[PDB]
Design a protein around this ligand. Sequence first.
Ligand SMILES: O=C(O)CCC(=O)C(=O)O
Ligand SMILES: O=C(O)CCC(=O)C(=O)O
Ligand SMILES: [Fe+3]
Ligand SMILES: [Fe+3]
Ligand SMILES: [Fe+3]
Lengths: 336, 314
Amino acid sequence: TPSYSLTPAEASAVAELTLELAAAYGSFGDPVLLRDLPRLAARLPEGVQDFLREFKLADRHGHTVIRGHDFDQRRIGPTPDHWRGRVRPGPEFPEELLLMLYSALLGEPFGWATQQDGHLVHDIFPIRSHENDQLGMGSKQLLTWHTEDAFHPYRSDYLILGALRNPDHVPTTVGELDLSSLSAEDIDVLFEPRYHIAPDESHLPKNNTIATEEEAARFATIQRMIDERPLGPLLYGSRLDPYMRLDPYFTSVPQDDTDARRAYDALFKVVDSGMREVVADQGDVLFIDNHRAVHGRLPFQARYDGTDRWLKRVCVTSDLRRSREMRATSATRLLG
Amino acid sequence: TPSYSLTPAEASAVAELTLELAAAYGSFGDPVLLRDLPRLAARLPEGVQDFLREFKLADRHGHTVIRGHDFDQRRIGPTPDHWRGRVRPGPEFPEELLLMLYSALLGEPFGWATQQDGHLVHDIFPIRSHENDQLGMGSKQLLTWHTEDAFHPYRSDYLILGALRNPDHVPTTVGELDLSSLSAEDIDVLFEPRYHIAPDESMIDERPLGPLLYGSRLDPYMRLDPYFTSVPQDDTDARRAYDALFKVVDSGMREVVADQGDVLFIDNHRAVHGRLPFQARYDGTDRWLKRVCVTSDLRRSREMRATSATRLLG
Ligand SMILES: O=C(O)CCC(=O)C(=O)O
Ligand SMILES: O=C(O)CCC(=O)C(=O)O
Ligand SMILES: [Fe+3]
Ligand SMILES: [Fe+3]
Ligand SMILES: [Fe+3]
């Protein structure tokens, strides 16, 4: 698994660029910033650009990491108690800008209209009231591994996780598919439409408002997946180095499909066993290929005192226009 | 339709950039050129990058034009006799690199393994041999406008047409979808998978029925190729809605001339295009365009590509 370690010189250049842009641009509310992102990203050190371009085009490894960024702790400040009600942009705006630049080298940043107020850069930190929940803002509970939004046709192509702080070194579990561990007949079954991947509750049409004609048409395709329960493959792309979509919790193997349960169980075992602990420490940016890796996070104890683990997250789509039917306008990057 | 007209300073900077690039890299066969394309495209004039980015994100127009490029006719030399056996790269290499840079701003260049030797940059010029053929390469057409590879799930998202020369100002036909002249019921049936679009002659695959309009029902994208399109006889509503869509699209068609120095960008989701018939001289002074197809999501086509690294489908 290749990675890139910044020299102090590159770390200084990235930090300075990031402060400069933060000063020149208001917030992510400025549409000019979004327009400018790929041009701005070409101001990053070339070695960094070449590295991510190789990763993108290589289409072989499931994740990579850029380590050794300078994330100024004094400037960044305390890990917040909640994402809601914060002054925007925060003092950590330069770091958010950084992830956005990286997202533009990989594709287009996008988000979900009902998630964290539609923010393109998401927060990941413990919220006390959320501590008995299996979600990003949790802590005590294990977040079992998953492809992000496995059921969703317009799910992330990549995820970018940047760690502003991780004092106790809590790992992000990430897992890839070792194809040689699997029967070739098992592979054949996994490539076939035999599995049902259930849509997560937050993306449910009836989960949001049933108001008006168009706000209904925005969820018609997902509603159809719920209504019709099409079966789908778990593996796809090239038979020799397949993409995968695996979220064990939302996956049903039909009871009578004996070949499918044998094959799935084989796939589940292979991926579970291959799960790696990947610590995104302060100044690390983790890149996950959503078509080649699953990920999760191990339990941890929060202090709730402003010192807790704090990651930023950007989802990336290779083709913003594919999701048009789920977007309110052509300009919006938010699904729903 | 918004367009960008380059100052002489911009034209000179672009020309200089493409000559410098033409001398640094061997051909598109060099994998590092393909790697570097987006970084290299950031060396174009900022006004040009900004303009294309706006076109791409606005998702509002069927086409745009960047005009006033300096395409050095002496260096470029005579419009060739044929594409085959002709040596790559030719003296018009700077101009091909230019289209490749534009393609990296919009997405990723790709091609078809079987088309013109699988050259990432395609030639469009009158061939005496392939003359009175339907083919794009022959001097006739009618007005058989089309979405490019309308049948194909991995068809181009954009088409880039650079006019090296066009002495008799031969138009490209370009048409968008005017919704106002269509009923809501019709649009709804057009969104459903009730139509067949047959393949073209120029692995895997199936035989399904697909829709003609997709995306937003208020501002739809289209996959329309009238020639290869049929409707099950029994589906009278689908035939009705198809007839109305055809009439709306066919009647809104516009003639757009790609003059020397013009780069025409066609959004394959929002416009159909074609060519108009024209008398060719065949004397090396004929109209010559370069063409690059752009995919927004290269990885989506992985199953029809020989390797991870290849940009050629089929
Ligand atoms: O907290 C982490 O390391 C990752 C959480 C996660 O699963 C996500 O952001 O999708
Ligand atoms: O020559 C033209 O103007 C159009 C060419 C064309 O139809 C194509 O290459 O798709
Ligand atoms: Fe996740
Ligand atoms: Fe989700
Ligand atoms: Fe065409």
